[PDB]
Each structure stands twice: as structure tokens, then as C-alpha cells.
Write a protein that binds this ligand. Structure first.
Ligand SMILES: NC(=O)c1ccc[n+]([C@@H]2O[C@H](COP(=O)([O-])OP(=O)(O)OC[C@H]3O[C@@H](n4cnc5c(N)ncnc54)[C@H](O)[C@@H]3O)[C@@H](O)[C@H]2O)c1
Ligand SMILES: NC(=O)c1ccc[n+]([C@@H]2O[C@H](COP(=O)([O-])OP(=O)(O)OC[C@H]3O[C@@H](n4cnc5c(N)ncnc54)[C@H](O)[C@@H]3O)[C@@H](O)[C@H]2O)c1
Ligand SMILES: NC(=O)c1ccc[n+]([C@@H]2O[C@H](COP(=O)([O-])OP(=O)(O)OC[C@H]3O[C@@H](n4cnc5c(N)ncnc54)[C@H](O)[C@@H]3O)[C@@H](O)[C@H]2O)c1
Ligand SMILES: NC(=O)c1ccc[n+]([C@@H]2O[C@H](COP(=O)([O-])OP(=O)(O)OC[C@H]3O[C@@H](n4cnc5c(N)ncnc54)[C@H](O)[C@@H]3O)[C@@H](O)[C@H]2O)c1
Lengths: 22, 331, 330, 330, 331, 22
């Protein structure tokens, strides 16, 4: 439930499972 | 309820159950001071940060409600301690949660240099084939006998004392240099103490760094000092990256004045073998700054940091704090 | 007389010693079928490493052999009983690399707990790690040494050296040895068990330090490998015939064994592209070099040369210091 | 200038050092009322042992004193705060007999478990033992060291030295210290408690190694002595004011404490025929000589003499190395 | 049921519950071979004995049904091993039940010689009063610093190895001499080995005896060898009384060539300060042969000896025996 | 219940309590 204040939503971290959510 | 932000991180599964009925938790997964959300800069009471982000005086002045900073770890050289005291901000850390993990990793690197094991394993994967005894003596040329050698330690702290005890079981002879300690500390542990850095380098066959990164020891192993070491010595660094000048170290490895070097921390991170002054240097072992990780150690340090925040919110500063490092500078 | 080095080419150390009492020669052979005919008829003594095996049929082909000296501590590649009947004495160098082997064993143990070889290998492949979450993933599996239990099979010269060094790190040490007397553990302050099964039940890391006799071939077989704990380690630096590699490979794949470090293998030389261990995760291998050192190499070669000289200028086996087939000798 | 030795007669070591910079004299006094009038008016520095106590009233009688050097490690017999206001610096020798005191502590511990002083004393009295049954009776009470728990109060220079030596015998070590930082026990691999009561509940032998400040006078009082286990030991080698001898005597008679070894007492010199411990079984006493050694005695006397010379030919307190009242100094 | 006799003893509270349904227990409480009852000499199958009685070949021939002798302890030098084998008698013992008790007692004696503690306690009881510092330096004159000294050990057995490990924690330098051991034993423990007895005495500051009393080392420390030791050395003996010539030792103490000596076993027992060659010798510490006693050790050795008898009666000799010392001589 | 075959019933060992049995 941690608030996602990730303003600069970049993708320099591929750290885990592959997200295949639709 | 107040707001608590994790400056550089995404996972908060451990801190959330503790700080759920006293504050609001958030994360920003930032890599620089310019990637912090505007809401954080205006409505943040406390913050948690790792070693991947550096804060200066200009960065601190942008906060309008910050009151406490907690560092998850033992080093705080990336935070301006004196400047934060003037502004009225307290700085805390976790002093000892990975003392034994770091000591074991230091011993692992020392043994790899004497009894060559990483290099032998690497050779087999490249396809090298050795059958006769003469071939064995050539691929593993350079191994030495540990007993009778001298080990030099710079900085006898928590980690430094742990390394000294384990090194005596293998037959090492231990010396150390520390100018901020009292008299008779070596008597209790049965060690030998020198008074100058130059004297330590003259009589050492292996040098390990365990000191802190203050403003009086930047580039401690510089070009001038690297020429005072013995012919064919080793070097292990697991404390900080700013204590060693990598440009001067590379030249020593090529000429052969230093037999080998094992490094865990570097000046520029992340580290890559294809970039930097150490692009092509023989006899080098590197690790990605992971001399502290453990399954038990990771959980212990995260829970302790979370409980430090809760005491500050529901108490008084700095009376309720246990590990405060800028108490003198605080006004 | 003539003295021959069965498997070797370099004789720079033995030559200055055996120059005024015998004639030195080398064969550089890899099998018993590559020995020159002159050696089989006019040889008094011989020197050999671990790379060649002699059987009873091979021994009968010699017509003047009187003494065999093994450069090292192991003699499982020579038929001891058969050589005694024919009237041949066998010698070895008992302790010249005790401390070198003990240090190498500790290096392998630390690599399994504090993953260091695997982390260094990952960087050379081009892996890049920047965030803390990436660090926790690449180095996932590291554990805390203090509080663990270490099991040792065979408390000999090397076994005792390993036990003393392991206590400084916080290990709890057990051992199993059925040929020792009573009270040896009292002096060193260790704990002793009576059965092999009991040792495997209560151990988190198993190290082999026994000898390869005829009663312990394939000691770690398929049946015994299922009696170990869930997620244990295994270190082998004694001999290759003590472990069944076919059963070990299956355990690594299924996950019952977290990792294994090996220095000796059933078939040598070792290659990652051949054998039952062609594709097995969490494996560390070295090319049978847990004994080499600059000082150790010179010491063992000089001692072996002086053993030959005493036999030639003395009487057998009264003048020999380290004889292993004295009972069988007639 | 004039330098005076308050309690002493021998000055063969200090004289060759302080001969070309000052004038040396001795008083051989046993109390503050036996100091010569010339000393009280024309003294710049002073040297003193532990046999004389100075209070604020005594300090005010000096008219030219500037520095006091204590030959030893303890300074509880000098009013530190009062001397700072008057402008007097106090120095000491921090570590010159760390290892001598640690060895003496271990000697007392072994005498309580493996009864050796009492057995030697019995033979001199004329006791004769011939049969095995007689041996079991005279030496009744000896125990096995391995598996026991050792409790330490105060982990300083001496405390750390004792802990390392005690682990070789199989002891289990705990300690209690409220003025230390976090993680000190991690480096040495010890166990730490948080309260004094918890230490006494789980200890079979208690040793005192703390300092005598104003918050721990009579630390082992009547109330706390009843919280120890049934049949425990007690060793004291730090100071005499930490133990209430009146309460200790009753415990020995009733049998709640099996034995006690003491090196320092509340009233000195000590005599077996006087005091609350006149008739108490299982007691070992020494005349406050746990620091003496041939090398240690010379080392501490030379260091103290050189501290005086630096103060005279320098500035206070910039040139001093071991100053204990720097904060209070004005 | 057969008869089992305790030659020198009166208490049988531990052995009785074990050997009650397989044999008949009895005791003699004898002090010499001439005080043994006639019934024992004719109808005894097994026997138990301590170190206080000696059996020779003539004594053994008087038994008509003896088959096994069990010695409660580790030493068996008071029994003629070879003669008993010819007559068809097996001898057993308890090898290791008081290894650690004896090692701790040896260290206690060593510390008393360096840090004088027994002598200081004895002086106070005599009425000596010391007040000034000068008096303290005089009564305790002779104490030395342990670190840097050399310790010599004769015989590296079970007890010898235990003493060596404990002595290294105090800073000692350890040497040993043993002609019946193999090669490389010192490599495992990290010690130093000499080849001759004379070389050990030349470079030692404290000598301890831990060997056995065979027929080739009677009076090992004789008059000739005692003059090869250093000026002002110590001597500790806790193995056997026949290894030291007390007549020559007394002269050395008086002249001052030996600073002190601690003894636990003597040639003639029981020991008295008013009789013998050591009637008036300075710097002497003696104990009444009690370096093995402990509450746990006493019970352990008595139960093990009783169970050895039961296996022999209800089994076969010497196949069922675990600790047999005359197996080669047995016919 | 140990049989007392102490033929030479001498008294060279005073090892314990005082026997006051009547
Ligand atoms: N994973 C990692 O790489 C890792 C993990 C933990 C700690 N560390 C680093 O280890 C270092 C030591 O940690 P610690 O817990 O032992 O620290 P500590 O603060 O307990 O002790 C540091 C010691 O360094 C000494 N020192 C300071 N400046 C010195 C100088 N110029 N020369 C010599 N000695 C000097 C101090 O007096 C003190 O004795 C720190 O830099 C810490 O950040 C690295
Ligand atoms: N570079 C190398 O790989 C290298 C170098 C040296 C020695 N080694 C090998 O190390 C091994 C041990 O050498 P060491 O000097 O310690 O030997 P050692 O002969 O001194 O001791 C061997 C021990 O093994 C015990 N043992 C025998 N069979 C056993 C069994 N079935 N179960 C348990 N214990 C048993 C013996 O009783 C003895 O205690 C040997 O096999 C040797 O060849 C390897
Ligand atoms: N011959 C002798 O009898 C002799 C010789 C030397 C020293 N000493 C005495 O030994 C004592 C220790 O000396 P040191 O060099 O180890 O001292 P130190 O100052 O180096 O260390 C003293 C330790 O005591 C701790 N401590 C203080 N108050 C405490 C309390 N109430 N509870 C628990 N711990 C407490 C301190 O925090 C510190 O860790 C001193 O009292 C000294 O005078 C006696
Ligand atoms: N309370 C006591 O006084 C007490 C208690 C137990 C044992 N002991 C005595 O301790 C001694 C040692 O016991 P252990 O268990 O260590 O014995 P052990 O049999 O295990 O070892 C004895 C060692 O002595 C060596 N040795 C033999 N002759 C020697 C010689 N001439 N020179 C040098 N070394 C020689 C042997 O080779 C062996 O290494 C024995 O004599 C035993 O009776 C005394």
C-alpha cells in the first residue's frame, strides 16, 4: 500500500518477474 | 498522519507493518537529487536512504519540513553532517549489523590471492586443459605459503578487530596503524602497533583498508605512497572507493610492483570491466559492492531503521535517539 | 645403477643429489605400455607421480626393481600387497603439504557461503548492477557462518588442521573416524559420533578427508546422498573415487544440494563439456592443484631423492624412514 | 624547581631523568599531616602511589602545585573535579600492567576450581593421606571447568584480556557494561546482557573489572548478594570499595557462596586476625600485588618521570599525553 | 556366581548395582601383596586395583583362577605386563577419563611459579605485614612476564596436546620432544619439534614432563642432565615419580640453579615435608597426588571399569574387550 | 552388601564419620 511517488518513472531497473498483466 | 519517504528504493515490505499506525509511507526510487517529487520536498518529516544517493548543503536547503534522516547502514560519508546540524536536522545510522559478514568476506579475498582459486576456476571455463604435472605448476604459478607472512591493517575498528582475530589462526603476523586510539589497546589483544603510515608500508606483505572516509584521508593510497610498498605485495580494499587512486594503481599492476589486488568498492559505480582506468590490468578481482549482504543481516538492519523513525515521531529529539552522529553540531 | 622417472621430464632438483651414486633418466610416460625396454630390465629404483597406475601384471614385468618412491602422500595407485610378495619396497613423503591443503579447503568453504567466485564471474559476462534491489538478487543465497555445523570424515593430519581453523569463524565441529583410539576428541575439545548416518543427519556442510582403501569405494553413493539435510554443501579434496558423480548431478538439479566444490574427479583431466556433470548448476572445480606451493614443491622433491640414495648405500628396509609395506615385505 | 615524591623513599630511576631540569626530593609520608612545610610552599609537581588520599582541603594547602602524576592506572583517591577548579592537571599511566593483572586473575580462578593452594596448605600442617578414600575427602569440591558460565562486570583493557584467555578452557562468557557502544561483542564473539540482575542469575563465577566512580560504591551489597546462584564463586581484583565485606562474611558461613578470592580490601593493610573476615571458611587473600613484575615496575616509573619533564619544558595541557581532568581544567 | 575382588579399596557403592546379577563382589582393603585373603587367591576370576599396590611375577603366580585385571586409571606401570601375558591374564585400563582435569592442574602449577600466589597467601597466614610499596616489591620479588618465554614439553600424548593449546593463549613459545611419533604431527598443530633431549633443555625456560614410565627412561632427570638446563629455570612434574632423581634436585634448589619446582608425584608416597631428601629445600610446591580428581570424572571411570568386567564374563577374551594392553603378549 | 574379606583388620585408615554405634 506504499504510495508510488515515482515521478521520474524511468526503466533503468529490470529487477524481477516478467509483468504480463492485461 | 505525517509522511515518511524512501528516497532510493521500491520495496517497503518490512517497514510498512511497523510504520502503518503512526505515519504514511511512500517511496520515490530516485537516482539523483533532481528526481525527487515536489510533494516530498514540502511535506516530509523523515527519510530513509541507501548509499546510492548523495546529499549536499544545497540539496538540504530545499526541504521545508525535514527533521530526521536515518541511514540504513554504517557509513554516512555521503551526507553533509555539519551542514545538517545548523539547519536543525538529526542524522542516525545502524552501527553494527554486518560486522561479521564483512569480516568473512575480507578473509575470502585474502585467501584467493595466496591460494589462487578464482583464477583457476576461470581458466577451466575458457577451455584450458591440463594433464601433466608440469602443466599444473605453470597454470598455478605464483601460490605462496601463508605462515610467516606479515599482515598490515589500517584502522582498528569493529571490522578491523574481527579480521585480526581470524588472521592469527592461519599463522599471520599482524600489525596495525591507528592515530585516534588510546594507549594499551594492543596489549589486550596481543598485537603490535606502529606510529607512522610509512613504517607500516615498509614491513608489510599484504595491506587491507578498514578506515573511514573523512576529509583528511582522501586518496590515501596516492602515487607517492604506492612507491613505498614492498616489491610484490598485495592490496585489499573493502571500506570505501575514495581511499585509492585507481589511475596510479593500474600502472603498478602493469609494471609488476604489485602482484595482485582485490577490490569491492570503486570510485565510480556501477563498475564495468570495459570502462575506466582499470580497463586492461592483469591480476584483478572485483565484486559488485556486496560484502555486507546476508539473509539475516538484511532483515535486521531494515527493522532497526524503521523503529528509529517511530521513536522520533512519538518522542523528543535527540533525547529519544540511540545512535545520533551529529549531536554536537545540532542546535 | 640406473634410476628412472616414470612420468616426468624435469629433473633439475634430483640430478645434483643422485649424480655420484647412480644414473638418472626419465620416460615421460602416460601408461604402462609406454615404458622403454631398457627400463624394464636395468632399473633399480623409480619415481612416480599420481598420473600413472601400476597393477600386479605391470610389476611382474620388472626384472631388477627393488624400491619405489612416491612423491606425495597418497599411494592408492600402487598395489601394496602384491609388491611385498615380489620383494619391492614402497615409500612416500608423509607430510610436506599439510598446511597448503588445509588453507585450500577453507578457501572453498568460504566461497560457498560468501559467494565470491560466482559474483566475479558474473561481472566478466557483462552483467550490470546499479540499484540495491539488483544487488540482493545477484547475490541471493549468502548465509551467516556463525551457528552452523561442520562435519568432517576422517581426522588425520589435514583433518586436524581444518578443525582448528574452523573454530575461529564460529563453526560447530563434529567428526567421524572408526580407526582412532579413545579420548582424541577430549584433547582438541571436539565432538565425536559413532556412525556415518548420524553425521549426515546433523550436518550443514560435509568435507571428505579420508583415504581410499578397498572398503570405502563410492562412499557417497545414491543411497547415502538421500540421507543428507535439505540444502547442504559438499567439499571434496581427498580423492575422486569417494563420490559417485552420476548421483551427485541429479541432486544438484533437483535442489537437494545447494552447491558443491570439487578438486578431484573420477576421470582426469576434467572438462566442463564432458562427463555426467556437463550441465549442473552451482559447481566449482579446480584442476587438482590443492597442494602446490613454491616452498612445498622443492621440499618434497629433495626428500624423495635422498630416500633413494639411502637405499642404494644401505640396507632395505632398515635404512628407510617411511616404508608402507613393511609387514607385507618378505 | 622542586619535585617531591609524596609516599616513597627510593628514587633511583627518576633521578637520572629529572636531574638537569628540576630538584628531586621525597617525603615518605603516610598521611596528609606528615608533609613537610617546604613542600607545601615550593613544589611544582608531585608523584604519588595508591597509599595516600588527597581531598579538596588538602589541595588548597598547596601554593605552587601545577601538576600531579599518578604512577598507575587508578585515580579514585584524588578529587579530580576539585583539582580542575584550582588549576591543577592530573595524569596517569594508562596501560603498563594489563597482561600482568590478567594473568593473576586467571590464577585465582583456577585455584578455586582445581584446589591447589588449600591442598599445599594442608600438607604443611602435617596432614597425611595414603588411601584413595582419603584423597577424595581432602580434595572434595573440585569441579569440571568445561560447560560453566563466566560473568564479567566491566569490559575494559583488563576485561578484554581475561575474556580471550577464558575461552581456551571451555568457559561460556557473558559481560555487562552500560557505557559501551553497540557491536563491541560482535567483533569478539561474546554475549551481552542489559541489566546487572540478569548477569547474576545466569553466572557460576563473577569477576569485577570496573572502576570506582561515585555511582557504584558497595556494588555487591546485602540485597544483591542474595540474587546470586547457590554455590557460586567471587573474584575481586579491581578495588576494595566495590564489595561489602560484612555481607560477604555471612554468605560464606551459611554456604551460599562456595569460595572467594580477594586481592584488594576496604581497609589496608590486611590481616587475618582483624576485620569482619576474621573467621570465614574458603578464603584466599593476597597483599595487593596483582600488578608487580620486574619489567612492569621499571616501565611505569620511567614513563611517569618523562611526563613531568614535558610539563616543565612545555605548556599545559597541550604537551601532556594522558590527562584525565582536561574538561574540568580552567 | 563367580567372585570379583577389589584389591585396595573399601567403597563399592558404584560397582555393586552393575555386577550384582552376574558375579559376587568383595573387597580386601589391602596395602601389600601379603595382606590378600586366602579365599581370593583361590576363587577369584577378576580384580580391580588402584595405583597404591604393585604386582610382580611372583605375586601373579600365586593366583589360581585369575583371568582378567582391570586398572582404574590410565597408568599401568605397576603391573608386569609381559609376565601376565605368558600366564594367560588380560590387562585393561580406562584410557581417557581425566584428560582435561590433568591439563587444567598443570596450567595452575605453571601460573603459581610465575605469578607467585601460593607463597604470598602462605606469608599472610604466618603473620607478615606489608604496608608500603617498597615492602610489596620485596615480598613478591621474583615475578616475571609470561609473554616471550619458551615452554618445553616432553611427550606429546593426550595430556601433552591439551597443555600445548592452552599455553599458546598466554603468549608462550612451545617446543616438544617425542621419538615415537610419526612425521608431520607438528604441522597440524603449528608447533616446533626437536630431535634430541639435550637440545630441548638448552633452549627452554620451563620444563614439563608428560611421558610414560617404561624401562628405558627411569631417572630421566638425573644428575648429569640437570646440569644441562638453563640458569634459573622451572620444573613441573605431574606424570610419575620415577622420572626425577630427588637427591639431585634438592642440591640444585639450594645452590640456585633452579628457581623453583612444583611436584604432584614423588618417588616415595605418601609425602611428608619432614622426611626425605627434600626435607629442607626452598621454593617448593607439593600436592598429594590429586591432579585427576573431579566429581564427574570419579563417577565416569568407576562405571566404565565395572562394565569391562561384565563383558569379559559374558563374552570371550580378548575379542569382547575394548581396551587391552597386553594383546600381543597374550597366548 | 559387599563381602568384607578384610583379613588383616588393621586401622591405618581413619576415613570418615565417627562410629558411635552400640
Ligand atoms: N559492504 C561494505 O563495503 C562495507 C560494510 C560495512 C562497512 N564498510 C566500511 O568499513 C569501514 C570501517 O567500518 P567500522 O565499523 O570498522 O568503523 P568504525 O567507525 O567502528 O571504526 C573505524 C576506525 O577507523 C579509524 N580511522 C579513522 N581515520 C583513520 C585514518 N586516517 N587512518 C587510520 N585509521 C583511521 C578510526 O579511528 C576507527 O578506529 C567504514 O568505512 C565502513 O563504511 C563497508
Ligand atoms: N592435493 C590434494 O588433493 C591432496 C593433497 C594431500 C593429500 N590428499 C589426500 O588427503 C587425504 C588425507 O590425507 P592425510 O595426510 O590427512 O591422511 P592420514 O593418513 O594422515 O589420515 C587419514 C585418516 O583417514 C581415516 N580414515 C580411513 N578410512 C576411513 C573411513 N572409511 N572413514 C573415515 N575415516 C577414515 C584414517 O583413520 C586417518 O585418520 C588422503 O586421501 C590424501 O591422499 C589430497
Ligand atoms: N593490581 C591491581 O589490583 C590493579 C591493577 C591495575 C588495575 N586495577 C583496576 O582495574 C580496574 C579496571 O582497569 P582497566 O584498565 O580495565 O580500566 P578501563 O578504564 O580501561 O576500563 C574500565 C571499564 O569499566 C567500565 N565500567 C565503569 N563503571 C561501570 C559500572 N558501574 N558497571 C560496569 N562497568 C563499568 C567502563 O565503562 C570501562 O569499560 C580499575 O579499577 C583499576 O584501578 C587493579
Ligand atoms: N593424576 C596424575 O598424576 C595423572 C593422571 C593421568 C595421567 N597421568 C600420567 O600422565 C602420563 C601421560 O598420560 P597420557 O594420557 O598423555 O599418555 P599417552 O600414552 O596417551 O601418551 C604418552 C606419550 O609419551 C610418549 N613417550 C613415551 N616415552 C617417551 C620418552 N622416553 N620421551 C618422550 N616421550 C615419550 C609417547 O610416545 C606418547 O606420545 C602417563 O604417565 C600417565 O600415567 C598422571
Amino acid at each position: 500500500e506504499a504510495l508510488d511517488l515515482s515521478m521520474k518513472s524511468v526503466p533503468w531497473l529490470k529487477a524481477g518477474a516478467l509483468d504480463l498483466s492485461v | 498522519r505525517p509522511l515518511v519517504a524512501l528516497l532510493d528504493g521500491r520495496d517497503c515490505t518490512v517497514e510498512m507493518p511497523i510504520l502503518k499506525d503512526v505515519a504514511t509511507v511512500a517511496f520515490c526510487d530516485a537516482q539523483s537529487t533532481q528526481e525527487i517529487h515536489e510533494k516530498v520536498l514540502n511535506e516530509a518529516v523523515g527519510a530513509l536512504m541507501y548509499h546510492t544517493i548523495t546529499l549536499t548543503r544545497e540539496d538540504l536547503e530545499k526541504f521545508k519540513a525535514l527533521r530526521i534522516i536515518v541511514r540504513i547502514g554504517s557509513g554516512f560519508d555521503n551526507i553533509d553532517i555539519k551542514s545538517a546540524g545548523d539547519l536543525g536536522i538529526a542524522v542516525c545510522n545502524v552501527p553494527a549489523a554486518s560486522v561479521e559478514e564483512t569480516a568473512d568476506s575480507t578473509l575470502c579475498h585474502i585467501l584467493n590471492l595466496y591460494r589462487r582459486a578464482t583464477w583457476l576456476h576461470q581458466a577451466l571455463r575458457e577451455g584450458t586443459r591440463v594433464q601433466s604435472v608440469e602443466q599444473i605448476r605453470e597454470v598455478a604459478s605464483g601460490a605462496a605459503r601463508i605462515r610467516g607472512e606479515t599482515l598490515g591493517i589500517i584502522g582498528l575498528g569493529r571490522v578491523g578487530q574481527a579480521v585480526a582475530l581470524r588472521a592469527k589462526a592461519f599463522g599471520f603476523n599482524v600489525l596495525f596503524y591507528d592515530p585516534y586510539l588510546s594507549d594499551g589497546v594492543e596489549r589486550a589483544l596481543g598485537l603490535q602497533r606502529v606510529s607512522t603510515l610509512q613504517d607500516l608500508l615498509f614491513h608489510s606483505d599484504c595491506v587491507t583498508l578498514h578506515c573511514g572516509l573523512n576529509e583528511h584521508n582522501h586518496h590515501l593510497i596516492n602515487d607517492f605512497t604506492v612507491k613505498q610498498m614492498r616489491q610484490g605485495a598485495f592490496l585489499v580494499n573493502t571500506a570505501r572507493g575514495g581511499l585509492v587512486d585507481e589511475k596510479a594503481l593500474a600502472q603498478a599492476l602493469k609494471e609488476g610492483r604489485i602482484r595482485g589486488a582485490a577490490l569491492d568498492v570503486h570510485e565510480s559505480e556501477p563498475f564495468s570491466f570495459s570502462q575506466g582506468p582499470l580497463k586492461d590490468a592483469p591480476n584483478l578481482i572485483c565484486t559488485p559492492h556486496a560484502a555486507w549482504y546476508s539473509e539475516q543481516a538484511s532483515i535486521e538492519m531494515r527493522e532497526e531503521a524503521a523503529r528509529e523513525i517511530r521513536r522520533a515521531i512519538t518522542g523528543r529529539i535527540p533525547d529519544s535517539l540511540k545512535n545520533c552522529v551529529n549531536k554536537d553540531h545540532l542546535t
